[PDB]
Amino acid sequence: DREVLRVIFPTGDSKVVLPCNLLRMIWNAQKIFHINPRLPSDLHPIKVVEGVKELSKKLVIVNGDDPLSRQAQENATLLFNIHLRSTLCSRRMAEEF
Amino acid sequence: QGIEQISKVYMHLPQTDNKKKIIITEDGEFKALQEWILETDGVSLMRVLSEKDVDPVRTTSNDIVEIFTVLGIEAVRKALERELYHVISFDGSYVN
Amino acid sequence: DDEEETYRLWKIRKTIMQLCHDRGYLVTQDELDQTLEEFKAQFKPSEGRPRRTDLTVLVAHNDDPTDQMFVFFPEEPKVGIKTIKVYCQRMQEENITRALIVVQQGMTPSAKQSLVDMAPKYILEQFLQQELLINITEHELVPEHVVMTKEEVTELLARYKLRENQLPRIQAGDPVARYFGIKRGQVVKIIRPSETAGRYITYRLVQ
Amino acid sequence: LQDLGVANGEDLKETLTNCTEPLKAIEQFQTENGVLLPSLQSALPFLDLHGTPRLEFHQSVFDELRDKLLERVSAIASEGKAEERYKKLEDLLEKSFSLVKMPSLQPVVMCVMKHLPKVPEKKLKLVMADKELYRACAVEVKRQIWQDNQALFGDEVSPLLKQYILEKESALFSTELSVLHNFFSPSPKTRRQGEVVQRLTRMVGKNVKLYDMVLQFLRTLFLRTRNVHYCTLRAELLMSLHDLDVGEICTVDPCHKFTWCLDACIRERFVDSKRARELQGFLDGVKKGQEQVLGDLSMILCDPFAINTLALSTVRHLQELVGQETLPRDSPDLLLLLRLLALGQGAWDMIDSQVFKEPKMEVELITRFLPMLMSFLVDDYTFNVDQKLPAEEKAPVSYPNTLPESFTKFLQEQRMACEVGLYYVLHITKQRNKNALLRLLPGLVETFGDLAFGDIFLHLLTGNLALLADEFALEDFCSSLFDGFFLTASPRKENVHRHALRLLIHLHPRVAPSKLEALQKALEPTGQSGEAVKELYSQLGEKLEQLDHR
Amino acid sequence: KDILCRLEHTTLRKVTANTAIYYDPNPQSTVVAEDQEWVNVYYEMPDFDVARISPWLLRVELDRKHMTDRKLTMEQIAEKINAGFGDDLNCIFNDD
């Protein structure tokens, strides 16, 4: 995904417009459930990986199962899927969030 | 010497990072090199692209019909998008 | 001048080899990476050897070996009818049906009629020498163009319940259209990066 | 160990055997075979206490110190004043050859023998005599024995020449036909990439005596076999020497420039005007007194790919003379092509007996054969144009399929005319001019020297015959080549029968049932071919049983 | 700057200070005394003057400043003129 972003954004501008504010949603998740960042968490990294996978399955812009619709689905949500996988990676989810 | 319809050529180093030669160094970091660019008055894009020791990739025009005649319809689509994005965002305003 | 001329002909050779690679015609890697000095060694031309007949080259298709193409270099400034006839007799001799011909700085309007009228049995395309000095496909503005086989076009039109006329158009005289040698009725899948979805695939009908 | 005054295991057991104090004797042996530094005789017990035996640090320093000894062998080869450095390496050789039997100092001495141009040949003789040294010896050791005596060179080139002919025979007899590829697609530099000729170049390196040795071996085997394979291997060895940029052969060999030109000729499979002028001036440098290399020069031309090159060049010249409105007498490059091909075909005769002369072209070959071929093409294209015109006439002009008997007479008496006619047939087969194909095929019943039945032409004609696959269902298209042409010389040479059987093995599904049945039962092994026709007939019978299910 | 000069259109008038159509009927002679020296340097060898050259003369001065700035030399201008007009115009130039 990093290489794909590098070829898409050759100028290195990270500012980009996208539907869902992932950082603000993470902050709201932190302050709704009273997340204490000083204590160890109870969230499996594998659960984070499978959750982001099935979520990305659920986000559909073009529907269908033939190769054409699947490729268009991948391309339509490529950038948002990259942003989602980078933001909700198990590393950052277990370290800072 | 020189290609007709080119009445003046200004050579300069752009201090703004947009036109700077942005590369990715071996560490994977973005580095914006300062390199000479030439901006001219009057356009002949086929000739100047055909010149020697000229970057034939990044070299572009502000004349859309030139782009359409020399490069094509997707190229002039992209060039038109960049040009009207430039004229809108010049004054600091933003549009989707 | 001899020096700029050999540099120019080497660059044109590079451009057409890249073109034939893009059209699916089999070209080895070394000729795609042929240095200028390699052009000097394999053949300075100031009537030493600018035999433009010798720069002409045959190429074959990757999957259709009987489908082959010539590229010809006429050494006269504006191409005349009789050399078109010589090239067509050459094609008859070798059974070739596709052959795009460069021109030095122009082409005679009589030849403009003489190539289109004999088109349906022998495909010929005329390229100005200025055009092939650069490979336009490497420019930052052109996105990736790939021609679609009729199977793919039928799949596309069945997916979106579309008719061919409903797609956006691309003129057959477009520079990239002439680069790929796509006739009317072909469909080009254009793949371009986008700042909202990352990648975007559109389709253009050749009309 | 005794060679330099040190004890062995038998001396140890003597020191233990029949002794009242064996332990002190063992300790004395240990002292007398330790590493002689004063810090070690105290450190040996201390390091022994750790659970690390003395031999372990010995193993570590062993690896380190022989690595440095090999480094310094290379250095003294490249370092020091010449007499001192060669004296040092020869003295170290005398020290070290007593331990080449041991598993340590073989490759060290092999490098020392690598970097000295000459050695006392006792050790080279031991290197060839012992199989382990015969393997592990450096390349210049092997070169020095070969440069001093040809026994090992013959002994090792004989299996390699045998393997080269194995590859040639197996590739020439292979049963694949396609529009995609054939076995003559690789250029000579493509075929030099095999380790046979590259290893032969390594065996020769940059030495001219070994070059003469491979030349004479290929000469003898070429004079006994009458086969172009050894000529091709000479050309491959010379251009592999050039691939290494071996100046010791390339600059002195008068044939190197000419073979380098021929390499590009074969790469395009034509003699274009540039390289044509080069090869023609190379020929015109043949003057009385210094023509001794004409035999070797034409021997280079014998390569199957060179025969294909020259023959297709002659066909192309014939075909381009049609459009030019010119007689064959006004074709200098064509005469050059035929001169080179006649030289190459006469190469073997030159090896048999040196005959230096530029041959003259037969009168009727230039004045009668080539204009008839041009007339055949003119009739072909007139018929094509008359077909393509709107409403020429009812039953448009029948293309002459006739045989002017001069054409067949030159196909069957004049060698050069035979071969150019063969490749003419091949080229029209690529272009699938069927009426021309059956115009020129009949009359091949008689041929000079069965050149129409050679492995090269028969392979290529098989390679073209999958283009018109459905015509094999018709009996005549196959019978014109099998019942009319192959069986005229199928029982005469093994290659013809094998070629027919592989052609039918590949194209069995499309040939008609009774036609392939009669082909097998007629092309059964007739008694002039060994295991090759046996395995091909086994495949023929199995695929005929398969056809019985078709 | 070299490439800039190579593509920016330069015409003859940019580098010329002035011209003058003299008459000077005998081409061995010159009406300008300073001209006669190097004209004689080009007239020991006849150069399309064995037959009667036209008895007119067109003498131009080229600015040293612009000639140095555009990296132009004396000879290549004459080469360009002879290419443009063939041998219809016999062109001589003073040594630099």
Side-chain angles (χ1 to χ4, degrees), chain A residues 35-40:
Chain A
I35 295 297
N36 192 346
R38 309 299 300 173
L39 311 179

Side-chain angles (χ1 to χ4, degrees), chain B residues 25-37:
Chain B
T25 316
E26 74 290 321
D27 61 355
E29 188 175 0
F30 278 91
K31 185 162 287 304
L33 305 182
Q34 185 66 94
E35 288 187 347
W36 293 98
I37 67 184

Side-chain angles (χ1 to χ4, degrees), chain B residues 9-47:
Chain B
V9 180
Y10 310 87
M11 161 175 66
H12 67 288
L13 291 163
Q15 306 305 134
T16 182
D17 302 336
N18 50 62
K19 285 170 285 182
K20 277 186 191 177
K21 175 62 187 305
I22 304 179
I23 64 176
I24 296 95
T25 316
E26 74 290 321
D27 61 355
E29 188 175 0
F30 278 91
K31 185 162 287 304
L33 305 182
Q34 185 66 94
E35 288 187 347
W36 293 98
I37 67 184
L38 330 172
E39 52 180 354
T40 182
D41 312 5
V43 294
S44 180
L45 186 45
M46 191 72 261
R47 297 290 305 288

Side-chain angles (χ1 to χ4, degrees), chain E residues 66-85:
Chain E
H66 302 158
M67 284 289 288
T68 51
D69 296 358
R70 279 157 182 75
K71 313 303 298 303
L72 281 159
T73 182
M74 204 75 202
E75 57 83 30
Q76 67 194 149
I77 293 163
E79 303 318 318
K80 191 65 63 59
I81 298 159
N82 284 279
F85 297 89

Side-chain angles (χ1 to χ4, degrees), chain A residues 8 16-18 72-82, chain C residues 192-200:
Chain A
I8 291 162
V16 71
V17 63
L18 282 177
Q73 174 50 58
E74 159 167 358
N75 295 335
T77 63
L78 171 59
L79 192 62
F80 184 76
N81 283 10
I82 290 172
Chain C
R192 61 161 168 271
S194 77
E195 57 169 292
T196 56
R199 188 169 301 104
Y200 184 63

Side-chain angles (χ1 to χ4, degrees), chain C residues 11-25:
Chain C
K11 202 169 188 296
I12 292 163
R13 179 56 159 271
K14 185 67 68 59
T15 299
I16 64 179
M17 286 288 174
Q18 293 166 331
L19 184 146
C20 293
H21 184 87
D22 298 352
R23 295 199 185 186
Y25 296 134

Side-chain angles (χ1 to χ4, degrees), chain E residues 10 27 29 40 47 52 65 85 90-91:
Chain E
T10 81
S29 72
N40 293 341
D47 301 329
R52 279 287 297 172
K65 174 59 69 175
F85 297 89
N90 177 24
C91 306

Side-chain angles (χ1 to χ4, degrees), chain C residues 10 13-14 17 21 27-36 38-39 42, chain D residues 187 189-190 267:
Chain C
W10 159 76
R13 179 56 159 271
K14 185 67 68 59
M17 286 288 174
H21 184 87
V27 288
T28 181
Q29 188 64 42
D30 59 74
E31 62 192 340
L32 296 171
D33 300 329
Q34 174 171 117
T35 65
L36 176 53
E38 182 170 348
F39 185 93
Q42 83 188 349
Chain D
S187 64
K189 53 196 165 57
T190 314
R267 184 61 179 75

